[PDB]
Each structure stands twice: as structure tokens, then as C-alpha cells.
Design an enzyme around this catalytic site. Structure first.
Site, PDB file in Angstrom:
ATOM      1  N   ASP A   1      -6.141 -38.236  14.730  1.00 45.69           N
ATOM      2  CA  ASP A   1      -6.389 -37.167  13.795  1.00 45.69           C
ATOM      3  C   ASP A   1      -5.114 -36.772  13.028  1.00 45.69           C
ATOM      4  OD1 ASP A   1      -8.181 -34.841  12.892  1.00 45.69           O
ATOM      5  OD2 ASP A   1      -6.473 -33.786  13.709  1.00 45.69           O
TER       6      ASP A   1
ATOM      7  N   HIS B   1      -0.049 -36.540   8.580  1.00 44.95           N
ATOM      8  CA  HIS B   1       0.877 -35.463   8.874  1.00 44.95           C
ATOM      9  C   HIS B   1       1.867 -35.814   9.969  1.00 44.95           C
ATOM     10  CE1 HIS B   1      -1.291 -33.128   6.019  1.00 44.95           C
ATOM     11  NE2 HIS B   1      -2.412 -33.557   6.575  1.00 44.95           N
TER      12      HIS B   1
ATOM     13  N   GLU C   1      -6.384 -41.565  10.923  1.00 42.54           N
ATOM     14  CA  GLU C   1      -6.966 -40.883   9.783  1.00 42.54           C
ATOM     15  C   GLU C   1      -5.889 -40.560   8.792  1.00 42.54           C
ATOM     16  OE1 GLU C   1      -7.367 -36.846   9.768  1.00 42.54           O
ATOM     17  OE2 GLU C   1      -9.057 -36.717   8.393  1.00 42.54           O
TER      18      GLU C   1
HETATM   19 CA   LIG Z   1       3.289 -32.914  11.635  1.00 40.56          CA
HETATM   20 CL   LIG Z   2     -12.162 -39.957  10.142  1.00 41.14          CL
END
Ligand SMILES: [Ca+2]
Ligand SMILES: [Cl-]
Length: 496
Positions: A197, A201, A233
């Protein structure tokens, strides 16, 4: 990392979004295994923040409080039971791993977690892990708000808070080790891989350092040297400094351009037409097929919450959705993921759904069981798209044609196209505002085949349309634009 670890002959996984572990275990045995599904992506199994305002939204599960296997989906024993029963039937489990962050920095301290664990966002304290102020990127982030303010700066996208979510300092070995401890726990339990996930980031290198700490798959079910399947992702449409190719060294990546473009083409937005799908795949600027995890919609863009926007097709657009899923499942590009959702009360206000936060069907917060109707559909508000004949049969179609080349393409220069997969399968679509009636070359051996969209092959007979292939492989196809399902699919195992 790039191999799904699915059983030979199973080519898709299904996202059983917000399902309970006991329901998934049963589904593995009663439907997934016999219908040939390769695996299941489960919702985050670790303890999360219990949010009551709004009432238990689906997104509270993306706000970790600890790594205890204790959620509305079940406890650790129920989770283990599910992994064991599914594996014993050849259906793999893929865990949604939320490792970029913990919960919102503004969340209230206390024990409003799914397992009663105490946590204090304000002081950065998560004793159940444990993590402290030293384990977050507070001092690393350089934005004035401490949050991500500009995606044109790849540094803040990785070191700052995604909309307030406390950002873990993934460069620290301690933090990398706590996350690996959690993931190794799941691997030794029997999971075959993970969805990482919010990979955009995280720095590709931090992710790699974590994967380097992971065990090989459980040798009781998997061959020696098996590595967990990794799909990251990463929402990468056009023009961002961060590219999904930066993450190819860690595993596969979600190709969000896939469902977005398929949605605009099938909806026929801005002059797009199905005839353009001739060179679908890398030719469209997509990532290489062997690094792609594809899907029509996902849990976060089927509610307008993500990549794709308004073009994304979902179960709400039943007729066009079936066609998009069919095309995806017949086409050779990437590894396919099928969505399985629940209905919620959509309420559009000014073009926006104000009820896009609503969590799974429940009774006082307790997730409802998936009930099965006599016709195989689900009740309790579960949509169960994976049980729709048109979708279920296309999952099987992909299995039967696995490895066959893309051939015998046909198109009318508009929205009527067809193509085959070697000599194992053939599919025809009519998305024009007129009827399709033509004899096409299928590359299939002569014989009578059952159309698997309109019907099924049931004991030497077809319940829907029948197609007759001639000695030269040619066959006539008739699809009116008024058909419930404007496409026909036949394959080696639907042959009479
Ligand atoms: Ca981060
Ligand atoms: Cl996804």
C-alpha cells in the site's frame, strides 16, 4: 517477487474487499477453488483505528495502530484458519500491507482500536508495536504543514504525511525490522505475497531493504526458494517526477493507466473507440506486461477516491463493466485482478458521492456474513462480481488460453472488434450503436462451442448461445447492440 505463486493453471486473483476471514475460507473451498481462481487479496489484517465519525468507514483500515492480527474481519486464529484452508485447496492469500504509515496525526489518543490497543498519535506513541517519536519522519519532512503539499517534489512525497497519516521512518533498521517481523509472521503462516500500500510514498530503496529481510514462502505448501509475490501500489498516470519503473527492482506495480484508458475507450469518451485497442498494452505507454498488475477498478477508485476519476467502470455500470472485465481477462497483457465489492448508498451531490466513506454491510458495526442465494449470487449487500457468470466464465477463459498468443484481430474501424488466443479461445465485442453480423476466422478447431457469456456448457449441451466453427476455422457471429451482454466468448473447454 514477480511470480504470483498461484497454482499452475490459475491466472487471476480476486479482491474480497472487507470480507471476514471465515467467509473467505468458506469461499475458497465452495467456489474459488472449483471455479479456478488463483488467489485472494484480503483487506489489511492488522489492528486499525476504530473510527465512529463517520461510522466505521472502509478507510479506517488504512490507519494502523499495531501489527496484531485483530480486525473486523476476524482474529489471528480465524486468519490462520483461512490461510490454511485456502492453501489446502490451491487458493493463495495476498495481504494488503500498510507499512508506509500509522494513523492520522490528529486522531485522538486512547483505545479506540479494533483490538483495544492503546495509542497516542499526538505524542507519536504506539506501544503495541512499539513505535515512538523517533520512528516517524516528523523531523525529515520539510514542508510547512508537515504534510505532502506538492507531488512535483519527489522528496516530500516520500518523507511527509500523506493527508496527515504519520509517516514511518523506513530508513531506520529498527522500523524496517518491525515491519519485516510482521510480514514474516504472515509468510510463515502461509501467505503467498503482498500488496504494498502507498508504495509511491516510500523510497524504492527502503522497500527493497525490507524485502531483503523477508522469508521464503512456507515450505509446507510452496517449493523451496519461493519468494513472496510483490505488487506495489503506485499511481502513475502522466507527468510526475515519480515513475512506476523506479520500483521494478522490488516486484510488480499496479498499472492504473490500464483501467483509466479502458474506461474512456469503452465509454467512448472523446472520440476513443475499441478499434484502437489493437495495440493495447505497452504500445499505449503501459509498463511491461511482466511487471504489471492490472484491473478495471479497485477499491479506491470505484468510489471516485482515486486514479481514473469518472472514467473508471464499476459494478454500478454492470453492462459496460462486464465487457471491460471480459476484454481484460481475454487479453494477454499483465496479471489480472478481479474486484469484489459491496453495495453502498451512493448519493451524488454536485457530481460527488457524499457516501463514498461507507464501510461494509454491517449490524451495529459488526460486518455481515456473505450469504449465498440459490442462484449463486450473494445477499447482505455483497455484490460478488466474481460470482457473475460473465465474469466467472472469463476467469476460466483466461486459464484455458494461458500462454496462447494474441491473434486473429478484427475490427470494423469503430467499436466492433474480435481476437483470439492461439487455438484455445476467441472473443467478439459489439459496442457500436448497430448490430454485428459477420463470419470471422477464429483459429479454433471445427466444432460446436458454447458461448460462455450468455450461458454455460452443462452436460453435453449449452445453456446460452452456440457457435459453429467450420473446417477452416471460420464462424458466424451475431450480436445486436440491444443484447444484455454485447460480446461473445468461446474456448477449448466450452466446446461440445
Ligand atoms: Ca513515506
Ligand atoms: Cl491497488
Amino acid at each position: 517477487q514477480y511470480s504470483p505463486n498461484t497454482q499452475q493453471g490459475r491466472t487471476s486473483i480476486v479482491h474480497l474487499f472487507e470480507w471476514r476471514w471465515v467467509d473467505i475460507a468458506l469461499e475458497c473451498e465452495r467456489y474459488l477453488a472449483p471455479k479456478g481462481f488463483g488467489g485472494v487479496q484480503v483487506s489489511p489484517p492488522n489492528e486499525n483505528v476504530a473510527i465512529y465519525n463517520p461510522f466505521r468507514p472502509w478507510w479506517e483500515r488504512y490507519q494502523p495502530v499495531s501489527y496484531k492480527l485483530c480486525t473486523r474481519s476476524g482474529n489471528e486464529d480465524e486468519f490462520r484458519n483461512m490461510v490454511t484452508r485456502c492453501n489446502n485447496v490451491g487458493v493463495r492469500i495476498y495481504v494488503d500491507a500498510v507499512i508506509n504509515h500509522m494513523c492520522g496525526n490528529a486522531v485522538s489518543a486512547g483505545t479506540s482500536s479494533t483490538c483495544g490497543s492503546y495509542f497516542n498519535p499526538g505524542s507519536r506513541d504506539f506501544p503495541a508495536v512499539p513505535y515512538s517519536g523517533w520512528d516517524f519522519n516528523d523531523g525529515k519532512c520539510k514542508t510547512g504543514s508537515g504534510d505532502i503539499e506538492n507531488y512535483n517534489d519527489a522528496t516530500q512525497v516520500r518523507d511527509c504525511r500523506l493527508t496527515g497519516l504519520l509517516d514511518l521512518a523506513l530508513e531506520k533498521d529498527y522500523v524496517r525490522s518491525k515491519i519485516a517481523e510482521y510480514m514474516n509472521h504472515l509468510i510463515d503462516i502461509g501467505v503467498a505475497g503482498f500488496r504494498l500500500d502507498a508504495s509511491k510514498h516510500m523510497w524504492p530503496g527502503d522497500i527493497k531493504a525490507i524485502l531483503d529481510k523477508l522469508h521464503n514462502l512456507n515450505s509446507n505448501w510452496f517449493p523451496a526458494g519461493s519468494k513472496p509475490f510483490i505488487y506495489q501500489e503506485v499511481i502513475d498516470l502522466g507527468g510526475e517526477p515519480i515513475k512506476s519503473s523506479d520500483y521494478f527492482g522490488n516486484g510488480r506495480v499496479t498499472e492504473f493507466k490500464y483501467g483509466a484508458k479502458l474506461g474512456t475507450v469503452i465509454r467512448k469518451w472523446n472520440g476513443e473507440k475499441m478499434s484502437y485497442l489493437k495495440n493495447w498494452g505497452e504500445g499505449w505507454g503501459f509498463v511491461p506486461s511482466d511487471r504489471a498488475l492490472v484491473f478495471v477498478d479497485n477499491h479506491n477508485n470505484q468510489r471516485g477516491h482515486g486514479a481514473g476519476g469518472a472514467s473508471i467502470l464499476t459494478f454500478w455500470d454492470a453492462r459496460l463493466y462486464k465487457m471491460a472485465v471480459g476484454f481484460m481477462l481475454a487479453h494477454p497483457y499483465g496479471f489480472t485482478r478481479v474486484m469484489s465489492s459491496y453495495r453502498w448508498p451512493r448519493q451524488f451531490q454536485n457530481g460527488n458521492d457524499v457516501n463514498d466513506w461507507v464501510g461494509p454491510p454491517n449490524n451495529n458495526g459488526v460486518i455481515k456474513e456473505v450469504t449465498i442465494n440459490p442462484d449463486t449470487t450473494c445477499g447482505n449487500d455483497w455484490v460478488c462480481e466474481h460470482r457473475w457468470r460473465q465474469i466467472r466464465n472469463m476467469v476460466i477463459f483466461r486459464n484455458v488460453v494461458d500462454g496462447q498468443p494474441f491473434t486473429n484481430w478484427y475490427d470494423n474501424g469503430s467499436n466492433q472488434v474480435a481476437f483470439g488466443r492461439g487455438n484455445r479461445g476467441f472473443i467478439v465485442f459489439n459496442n457500436d450503436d448497430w448490430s454485428f453480423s459477420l463470419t470471422l476466422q477464429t483459429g479454433l478447431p471445427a466444432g460446436t462451442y458454447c458461448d460462455v457469456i450468455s450461458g454455460d456448457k452443462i452436460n453435453g449441451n449449452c445453456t446460452g448461445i452456440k457457435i459453429y466453427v467450420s473446417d477452416d476455422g471460420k464462424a458466424h457471429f451475431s450480436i445486436s447492440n440491444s443484447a444484455e451482454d454485447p460480446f461473445i466468448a468461446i474456448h477449448a473447454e466450452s466446446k461440445l
